[PDB]
């Protein structure tokens, strides 16, 4: 909330990973964990851990004097720029004027022009630098510092804003998204929900309580030191914090945190804990339960895991599931991140996967002789085409067509013929796939025809 208490101060100095976890466990038992304290601690230890070093063991000591002095600079700066008497609070509800004011305070502090490791309040206070979702978190932390108990962090799969008022019914943009887009700060999120873009998830985005905001800052830990190296201490810290959050129920409504935790258990399993597959499916279960099964990443997480373990069949099934979800969206101008992923899956990962399967059959595999896997591949491309329908900007182009042809050609015409395509039994939903269904089962594949059909207007 506001002001460091002795029950926090007594747990300093922080001299290890487990010392930090202990501070987080204490804070998560309180009704309102201190977002400013916890973010400064994580940003401090990440700042000094995210560098290559000589020395087997190393932990940068978070002395209370350094942390409390940064905490005082943040609090002084926020209290000293926001006069709460100029803003009425009508029954535990902040006004859009107050919220916009706090957002402007953060925004006007940011360095005039400048990356990794600028997500925490440590970066804000010591360098006046924040990344995009860091701004939105800084706004929420400032509001908590001001006592605005109703201002909370809202998250989609690629963007962050704030919600406030009863149940978080009021929304406000507080940060930027993408690179060259016009500033929407102060605006509601309603146009983004209404446009049916993936960026705003058709309204099925996360509305955090304080403890989910703690989970956010934990997910925001970046162990990456350079393009070839991750900090093992930061990975272990994030993993232990995520299990702590898991145990207390604070990942129940956070699919991406569950996938992150699954990924960390894939990297280094914790004895006695659920296995990665259980965790991925819990992330999917969370998205179905709380978010209308309208999230893409729960299935991308699962797909990537099957891919890495060479379960080719479930990888394609999970990828078809991502396309089944995205089909109900419209591809809008700031959805490029999910485009990039579908592109990379269709034109890089799926090809390589099928190519390795072909080299396995020739040397002695089963997936290319499995009509189910062919069906999954067809369901994936059908979702992509349906996704394109009604969108303000096209999805498919000749590059996509090149690898569709190649991937179809990875299945012997006899194997492809074994699938019942209805407008293994499989129902198409897109016009493009409907219009070329016969071309998909032909003993010989008309590349010229499929390519101009897949790229038709």
């Amino acid at each position: 909330a506001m002001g460091l208490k002795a029950a926090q101060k007594t747990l300093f100095p922080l001299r290890s990973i487990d010392d930090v976890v202990r501070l987080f466990a204490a804070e998560l038992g309180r009704e309102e964990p201190d977002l400013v304290l916890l973010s400064l601690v994580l940003g401090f230890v990440e700042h000094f851990l995210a560098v290559n070093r000589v020395g087997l063991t190393y932990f940068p000591v978070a002395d209370l004097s350094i942390i409390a002095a940064l905490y005082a600079r943040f609090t002084a700066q926020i209290r000293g720029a926001v006069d709460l008497s100029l803003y009425p609070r009508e029954g535990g509800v902040s006004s859009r004027e107050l919220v916009k004011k706090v957002s402007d305070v953060i925004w006007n502090s940011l360095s005039r022009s400048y990356r990794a490791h600028i997500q925490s309040l440590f970066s804000f206070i010591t360098g006046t630098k924040l990344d995009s979702s860091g701004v939105a978190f800084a706004v929420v932390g400032a509001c908590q510092a001001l006592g605005l108990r109703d201002v909370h962090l809202a998250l989609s799969e690629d963007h962050a804003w704030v919600v406030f008022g009863p149940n978080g019914e009021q929304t406000a943009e507080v940060t930027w998204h993408g690179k060259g887009n016009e500033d929407r700060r102060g605006q509601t999120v309603n146009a983004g929900v209404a446009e049916r873009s993936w960026l705003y998830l058709k309204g099925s985005y996360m509305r955090c309580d304080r403890k989910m905001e703690v989970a956010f800052m934990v997910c925001a830990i970046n162990p990456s030191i350079d393009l070839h190296t991750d900090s093992l201490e930061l990975l272990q810290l994030q993993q232990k914090l995520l299990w702590l959050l898991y145990d207390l129920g604070h990942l129940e409504r956070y699919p991406m945190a569950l996938g992150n935790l699954a990924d960390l258990e894939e990297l280094e399993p914790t004895p006695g804990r659920p296995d990665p597959l259980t965790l991925y499916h819990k992330g999917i279960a969370s998205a179905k339960t709380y978010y209308r099964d309208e999230h893409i990443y729960p299935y991308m997480y699962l797909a990537g895991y099957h891919c890495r373990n060479r379960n080719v069949r479930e990888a394609l099934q999970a990828w078809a599931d991502t396309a089944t979800v995205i089909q109900d969206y419209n591809y809008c101008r700031e959805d490029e991140e999910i485009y990039k992923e579908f592109f990379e899956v269709a034109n890089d990962v799926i090809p390589n996967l099928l190519k390795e399967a072909a080299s396995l059959l020739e040397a002695g595999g089963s997936a290319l002789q499995d009509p189910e896997c062919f069906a999954h591949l067809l369901r994936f491309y059908d979702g992509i085409c349906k996704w394109e329908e009604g969108s303000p900007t096209p999805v498919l182009h000749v590059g996509w067509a090149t690898f569709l042809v190649q991937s179809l050609g990875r299945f012997e015409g006899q194997v492809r013929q074994k699938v019942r395509i209805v407008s293994p039994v499989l129902t198409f939903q897109s016009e493009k796939m409907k219009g070329m269904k016969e071309l998909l089962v032909a003993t010989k594949i008309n590349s010229s025809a499929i390519k101009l059909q897949l790229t038709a207007q």
Side-chain angles (χ1 to χ4, degrees):
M2 49 165 285
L4 298 172
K5 313 263 178 258
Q8 304 156 345
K9 304 191 227 227
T10 195
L11 299 173
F12 282 78
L14 306 179
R15 294 177 41 89
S16 70
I17 285 163
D18 291 342
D19 283 356
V20 170
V21 180
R22 248 178 302 269
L23 172 61
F24 274 73
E27 280 305 291
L28 286 170
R30 314 203 213 293
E31 147 177 275
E32 176 115 354
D34 192 318
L35 298 179
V36 170
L37 165 65
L38 298 170
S39 171
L40 279 170
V41 158
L42 286 183
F44 176 89
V45 316
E46 173 168 329
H47 185 255
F48 291 99
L49 277 170
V51 57
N52 285 311
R53 76 179 184 254
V54 179
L56 208 66
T57 66
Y58 176 72
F59 191 85
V61 178
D63 294 303
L64 175 65
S65 62
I66 179 87
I67 292 313
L70 300 176
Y71 183 107
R73 274 150 79 183
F74 185 77
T75 297
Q77 153 166 220
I78 301 305
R79 299 206 278 219
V82 175
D83 189 331
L84 290 180
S85 47
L86 326 182
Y87 304 89
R89 158 172 289 259
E90 53 285 24
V93 177
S94 320
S95 65
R96 166 162 320 254
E97 294 66 42
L98 178 57
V99 174
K100 173 65 169 195
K101 173 59 172 172
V102 173
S103 176
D104 294 340
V105 167
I106 297 302
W107 188 259
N108 289 339
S109 318
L110 294 175
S111 151
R112 331 302 139 174
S113 199
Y114 44 113
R115 221 64 62 199
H117 315 294
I118 54 164
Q119 72 276 39
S120 75
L121 295 186
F122 180 87
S123 174
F124 178 72
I125 293 139
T126 65
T128 74
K129 282 192 278 194
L130 285 172
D131 59 22
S132 176
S133 58
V135 170
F137 179 92
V139 174
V140 177
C143 292
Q144 182 192 44
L146 289 164
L148 316 182
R149 290 189 50 124
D150 68 307
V151 184
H152 286 288
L153 183 67
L155 302 161
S156 66
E157 297 184 306
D158 194 49
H159 183 46
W161 57 94
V162 307
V163 298
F164 56 106
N167 309 285
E169 61 176 40
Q170 304 285 324
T171 71
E173 296 277 6
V174 299
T175 196
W176 79 89
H177 182 259
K179 194 225 147 184
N181 307 293
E182 181 195 9
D183 193 62
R184 288 192 299 277
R185 294 178 51 255
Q187 272 163 239
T188 75
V189 153
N190 295 335
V193 175
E195 88 194 347
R196 220 180 187 88
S197 59
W198 164 77
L199 190 59
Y200 293 89
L201 295 174
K202 287 180 274 168
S204 293
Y205 55 80
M206 295 181 63
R207 303 173 130 96
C208 299
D209 61 16
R210 293 271 98 109
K211 281 163 192 181
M212 291 161 76
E213 281 140 14
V214 176
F216 169 76
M217 84 170 85
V218 170
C219 287
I221 294 166
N222 183 351
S224 186
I225 294 163
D226 62 34
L227 294 163
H228 294 296
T229 317
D230 286 330
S231 164
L232 297 173
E233 291 86 8
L234 287 174
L235 289 162
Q236 173 187 158
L237 177 58
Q238 188 186 52
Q239 190 170 20
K240 291 185 162 168
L241 290 176
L242 286 177
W243 274 125
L244 171 63
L245 291 157
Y246 179 98
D247 284 347
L248 301 173
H250 302 320
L251 305 192
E252 170 71 17
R253 300 157 141 84
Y254 198 162
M256 284 178 60
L258 290 163
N260 201 333
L261 182 56
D263 280 355
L264 291 154
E265 294 289 312
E266 186 196 8
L267 201 53
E268 175 121 27
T270 308
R273 287 293 189 177
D275 66 4
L277 261 173
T278 303
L279 285 158
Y280 294 115
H281 278 99
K282 288 190 181 290
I284 289 167
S286 173
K288 286 147 134 54
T289 299
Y290 303 105
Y291 303 106
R292 310 184 211 268
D293 202 3
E294 294 184 317
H295 287 191
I296 306 298
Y297 287 159
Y299 302 101
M300 284 292 187
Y301 275 112
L302 175 63
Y305 177 80
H306 284 312
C307 180
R308 292 191 291 282
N309 290 268
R310 300 309 173 184
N311 311 313
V312 170
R313 194 216 86 86
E314 289 105 312
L316 294 154
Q317 177 176 40
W319 275 319
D321 286 340
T322 68
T324 294
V325 177
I326 199 65
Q327 80 178 325
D328 195 55
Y329 281 92
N330 288 337
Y331 180 45
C332 299
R333 54 149 202 156
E334 310 201 10
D335 284 356
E336 280 198 356
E337 184 57 38
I338 205 66
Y339 177 79
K340 286 176 179 149
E341 298 199 31
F342 276 112
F343 188 96
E344 157 96 352
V345 168
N347 308 322
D348 188 297
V349 187
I350 283 168
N352 285 327
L353 244 198
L354 296 184
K355 175 173 183 201
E356 302 168 67
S359 290
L360 183 52
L361 208 49
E362 294 173 11
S366 269
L368 294 191
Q369 288 192 333
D370 186 1
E372 271 305 324
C373 301
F374 187 59
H376 294 331
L377 177 76
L378 298 179
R379 176 153 75 86
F380 170 81
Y381 274 95
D382 186 48
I384 307 308
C385 288
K386 182 53 170 39
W387 178 35
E388 183 177 61
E389 298 177 17
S391 299
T393 167
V395 169
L396 281 312
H397 59 48
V398 70
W400 291 80
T402 307
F403 298 96
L404 170 61
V405 165
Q406 191 186 49
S407 303
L408 287 172
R410 291 292 174 189
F411 297 87
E412 88 191 60
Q414 184 258 49
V415 155
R416 299 182 282 127
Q417 280 164 202
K418 290 211 184 177
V419 164
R420 277 303 145 204
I421 308 170
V422 166
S423 288
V425 48
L426 164 87
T427 314
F428 279 173
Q429 307 288 330
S430 61
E431 284 315 312
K432 279 196 195 180
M433 292 299 286
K434 278 176 186 165
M436 78 176 57
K437 52 177 311 172
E438 292 313 345
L439 300 63
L440 292 170
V441 278
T443 36
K444 277 252 175 153
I445 287 145
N446 187 349
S447 123
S448 319
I450 290 181
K451 301 224 247 205
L452 204 139
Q453 283 214 21
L454 191 85
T455 62
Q457 189 255 30

